Amino acid sequence: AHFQSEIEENYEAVGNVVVDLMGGCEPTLRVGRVQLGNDIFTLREEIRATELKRVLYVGTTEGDEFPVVVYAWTNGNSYESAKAFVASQGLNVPCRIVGYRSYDKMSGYTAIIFPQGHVYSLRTFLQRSVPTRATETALYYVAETLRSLCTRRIIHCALTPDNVFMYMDSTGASLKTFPVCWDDCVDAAMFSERGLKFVPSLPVLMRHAVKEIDGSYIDFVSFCRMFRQIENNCSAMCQKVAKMKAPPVVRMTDYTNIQTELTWDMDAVMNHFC
């Protein structure tokens, strides 16, 4: 019944492979070639998620091949890969998730493989180069994705534009959103079934100022902050969301209310990025 006992038993049981790394075989992630387990990646770009004090990498699978996102967990008992897999099971995004854990359980890594399309951080869509209609389109899909997590009662707790990724397939017809660093995420239904309360030493409780994570309030405020970080804020509507005050109880319709006012224009996205 210990919080750690149940967290571990729960996330060891999810049907996603975790590859154990042997002493000496815990890579230092950086741009260039990285080998994790038997898997080789060419990391091309370093992403600095400054609000989370973390870095992430985007590259391709060994060969000029499949797009990938690679990053280290907060720690080797974060079960981040298992948390990201559970999350993937309820989103419409084509993603293969591989978890790697040091033999000493001290370090951890996640690789996520997408189909042969294009992968962009949400941050890319917030840059002042991007036309407004493309920016709004990405945020339109994010609204759907966060509304879907809200219904499932999964709270991410560390959402930023640097750790939300937009997958665009080779046709350019749509964006498919997958947030990534899930080390601190709250599966409220899972908690309730295993009889789990928050314990005072959880980075998630210290990081926010709360004694509990109850509902999607934290994720909704995260979403609103992303609107503050639009570098060419042209929309009075987007300006409105950036300054808005979060309702004390978050419901799916709070995401719907934002989504209804955003432009969906995949042609503007396609024209500027391809």
Numbering used by the authors: 367 to 640
Tell me what the authors wrote about this structure, in their words.
Here, we discover that KKT14 has a pseudokinase domain in its C-terminus, which is most similar to the kinase domain of Bub1. The N-terminal part of KKT14 interacts with KKT15, which we suggest to be a Bub3 orthologue. In this study, we propose that the kinetoplastid kinetochore proteins KKT14 and KKT15 are divergent Bub1/BubR1 and Bub3 orthologues, respectively.
Apiculatamorpha spiralis KKT14365−640 crystallized with two molecules in an asymmetric unit. Both molecules were essentially identical except for minor variations in flexible loops. Interestingly, a structural homology search using the distance-matrix alignment (DALI) server revealed similarity to a protein kinase fold with an N-lobe and C-lobe. The N-lobe contains a five-stranded β-sheet, a helix termed the C-helix (αC), and loops that correspond to the catalytic loop and activation loop, while the C-lobe comprises a bundle of α-helices. Although most protein kinases share a similar fold, we found that the most similar structure of A. spiralis KKT14365−640 in the PDB database was the Bub1 kinase domain. Human Bub1 was the top hit in the DALI search with a Z-score of 15.5, while the next best hit was the MST3 kinase (Z-score 13.0). The higher structural similarity of KKT14 to the kinase domain of Bub1 rather than other kinases is owing to an N-terminal extension that is present in Bub1 and KKT14. In the crystal structure of A. spiralis KKT14, W548 (the phenylalanine equivalent of the DFG motif, which is CWD in A. spiralis KKT14), strictly conserved among kinetoplastids, faces away from the active site. Similarly, in both the crystal structure of A. spiralis KKT14 and the AlphaFold2-predicted structure of T. brucei KKT14, the N-terminal extension makes extensive contacts with the N-lobe, which may stabilize the pseudokinase structure.
